[PDB]
Symmetry: C4
Subunit: 33 residues, 4 copies
């Protein structure tokens, strides 16, 4: 239930790291700080 939802919201806030590592991919393609 409640603590299912909050601990999926755990996973998403891992996928929004995997967002950071998107950018750090893009900043590879750019060599940008």
């Amino acid at each position: 239930x409640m603590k299912x939802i909050e601990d999926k919201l755990x996973e998403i806030x891992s996928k929004x790291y995997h967002x950071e590592n998107x950018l750090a991919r893009i900043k590879x393609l750019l060599x940008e700080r």
Copy 2:
């Protein structure tokens, strides 16, 4: 309701695959492991 929210959180954790396939796009542009 509760089980609406948990099964949107189903969809998001599909969109955060569609994140994986972003990266696997970027790693196309880079030919990187």
Copy 3:
């Protein structure tokens, strides 16, 4: 409250379109189907 959360989960499932339009950016950089 409940119907705050479900209608943020509205917004996210708009941001995960704005994911589609990431890819359709990347597929610009690639000219890929």
Copy 4:
């Protein structure tokens, strides 16, 4: 609890800015409006 979830959904709708700034990276690689 409820107001934990709504204020993670705060963070996500920050990560879906950090989506905008993905695109504004991609539009760097493209020089596109």
